[PDB]
Design a binder for these strands. Structure first.
Ligand SMILES: [K+]
Ligand SMILES: [K+]
Ligand SMILES: [Mg+2]
Ligand SMILES: [Mg+2]
Length: 135
RNA sequence: ACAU
DNA sequence: CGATGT
């Protein structure tokens, strides 16, 4: 079981959980940063991981790329498979923004198709995912 | 327990 | 140490 180097890797970074959430996607082989989401004032780690995968799906579809996506998040990979983010985060004014983004990401999954493999990054064998924030 |  | 998740 070896790394698929021709892939996109995503990760979340946060200040608090729940807290400020950002995410980015990188070329697994080179580390080149391909997209970075503006920090969201309040969210959860798993909402960020979910949004990062869905943004990766949208990024690769727009560019007609068949590359797989690596995520280290068991939770987010399942949420994407399910097309349903089962977050416990309260819905209030402070969490409105991230919940809007999560709702819209689910909506995108329910109205689009993709063949993109979404693969578990095996941190125990390979070290930190290439998109890691190092926090 | 596993993944963050 | 605490929080998010299956
Ligand atoms: K980190
Ligand atoms: K736990
Ligand atoms: Mg991660
Ligand atoms: Mg990380």
């Amino acid at each position: 079981e070896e790394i698929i180097w021709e892939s996109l890797s995503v990760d979340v970074g946060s200040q608090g959980n729940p807290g400020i959430v950002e995410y980015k996607g990188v070329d697994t082989k080179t580390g080149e940063v391909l997209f970075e989401r503006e920090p969201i004032p309040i969210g959860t780690n798993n909402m960020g991981e979910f949004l990062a995968i869905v943004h990766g799906l949208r990024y690769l579809k727009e560019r007609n790329s068949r590359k797989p996506i690596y995520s280290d998040s068991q939770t987010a990979i399942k949420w994407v498979k399910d097309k349903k983010a089962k977050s416990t985060l309260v819905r209030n004014e402070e969490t409105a923004l991230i919940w809007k983004l999560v709702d819209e990401a689910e909506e995108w999954l329910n109205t689009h198709t993709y063949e993109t493999p979404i693969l578990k990054w095996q941190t125990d064998k390979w070290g930190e995912i290439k998109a890691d924030y190092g926090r």
